[PDB]
Amino acid sequence: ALYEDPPDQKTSPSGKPATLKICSWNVDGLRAWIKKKGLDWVKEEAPDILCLQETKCSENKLPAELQELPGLSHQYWSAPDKEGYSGVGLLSRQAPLKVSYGIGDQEGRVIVAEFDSFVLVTAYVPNAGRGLVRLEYRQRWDEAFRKFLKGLASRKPLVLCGDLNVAHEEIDLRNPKGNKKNAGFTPQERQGFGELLQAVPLADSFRHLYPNTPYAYTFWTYMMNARSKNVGWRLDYFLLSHSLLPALCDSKIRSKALGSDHCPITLYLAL
DNA sequence: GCTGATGCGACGACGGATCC
DNA sequence: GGATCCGTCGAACGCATCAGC
């Protein structure tokens, strides 16, 4: 069945107005994404902060359009050995207080940015691989990432966004039965997600607001016209510290924005 | 400099078995 | 014998390198 994201809820359940708009997007090739008008969609969304994953592009090769974003002028980029794979980016209206890269362990998968009242982490979580060939590495990465997140020295609440490369529960993908042995829906990856929520701790912004809504995905394989059929997976998330839930206005899935095999997601917080 | 081949990374459609 | 379950296989993309000119 197709899906239509509900209207933007820009007021917290208590009645306060959203003051921060964050957008996260696995662009699957930043230069390709830019040629497919991805940046015109970003300008329409007008977020305060924009996080990109799988840019596959070192900094010296960022297209000039990225220098013409006056509302997103503080930009931090991180790329891996394997040029052309992985790579993440964080663009912000306001300068962060602090920026770092990695999870303490140059893989180009994580950017950490401390703002006035919260710490933002954007992540491109390693894929378990076709045939699960890198599933054990993923499991080790999950555990190191949890530890890193828990151990963040700031007593500030946490927002974690990006492509976490797992559909947490059967409601998070179209074909759960035939994918329980595929990357992104193994019992090992699902358990790692549950442990991330438990240990840090974190809530899944979208599922907390829409706990029973099926067919909401953020990824569709390019092949077999899966997107047109909405055969997809929910792989991209905003996860929030418990204390941030009263500030949570909405968590969106921008199903119609093209340019990649993932669609943008967007968080509204009242801070 | 530019093109196209090739390599590499990132599952839904389908065919067959089992079950009541 | 429709529903389900299971394992097998080809395929849309982006980016790097390489060969050729």
Cβ–Cβ < 8 Å for A204, A171 = no
Burial class (CB in 10 A: 0-12, 13-18, 19+), A210: middle
Residue closest to A112 by CA, chosen among A135, A92, A137: A92
A4 appears as a binding residue in the annotation: no
Pair A93, A72: CB distance under 8 Å: yes
Cα–Cα distances in angstroms (integers) from residue A84 to residues A30, A59, A77, A79, in the given order: 10, 11, 14, 9
* C-alpha–C-alpha distance, residues A226 and A12, integer Å: 34
Instruction: Give, to the nearest 10 degrees, the angle between helix A135-150 and helix A187-199.
Output: 0
User: Which amino acid belongs to residue A30?
Assistant: L
Judge contact between A126 and A134, C-beta under 8 A. yes
Of A265, A260, A261, A219, nearest to A38 (Cα)? A260
Question: Quick one: DSSP state of residue A145?
Answer: H
Measured to protein CB atoms, the chain C nucleotides within 7 Å are 5-8, 10-17
**CA to C1' distance (Å), from A14 to B10:** 42
Question: What is the tally of structural domains in chain A?
Answer: 1
Measured CA A117 to C1' C10 distance, in angstroms: 50
- Is residue A124 flagged as an active site residue? yes
Which protein residues have their Cβ less than 7 angstroms from some atom of strand B?
A 84-85, 126-127, 129-130, 134, 173-175, 178-179, 182-184, 221, 223-224, 226, 229, 231-233
Q: Which of A100, A121, A119 is nearest to A53 (CA)?
A: A121
C-alpha neighbours within 13 Å on the C-beta side of residue A199: 17
Decide: A259 and A220 in contact? Cβ < 8 Å.
no
Identity of residue A198: Q
DSSP A252: E
Distance A19 CA to C5 C1' (A): 49
Contacts for A72 with CB less than 8 Å, ≥ 6 apart:
A42, A47, A49, A50, A91, A92, A93
Residue A122 · residue A173 · CB < 8 Å: no
Give the residue carrying structure tokens 């929030």.
A240
- The pair of structure tokens assigned to A117 is 């009242």
Please tell me the distance from the alpha carbon of residue A184 to that of residue A134, in angstroms, as a whole number.
12
For A86-117, b/e burial (b = at least 16 CB within 10 A) is bbbbbbbbeebeebebebeeebbbbbbbbbee
**What's the full length of chain A, in residues?**
271
A83 has binding-site annotation? no
A116 is in an annotated binding site: no
Beta strands in A116-198 (DSSP E): 119-124, 158-163
Omega of the bond prior to A201 within 30 degrees of 0, cis? yes
CATH number for position A87: 3.60.10.10
Place of tokens 């300068």: A95
Domain coverage including residue A47: 1-271
CA-nearest of A2, A38, A10, A26 to A252 is A10
Nucleotide nearest to A222 (CA to C1'): C12
Using DSSP's 3-state secondary structure scheme, residue A194 falls into: helix
CA A154 to chain centre: 21
The token duo for A119 is 């710490």
Give the list of residues 6+ apart from residue A86 with CB closer than 8 angstroms, or none: A54, A56, A79, A80, A107, A108, A109, A124
Q: Which residues pair with A54 in a beta bridge?
A: none
Q: State the catalytic residue, choosing from A48, A168, A237, A262.
A: A262
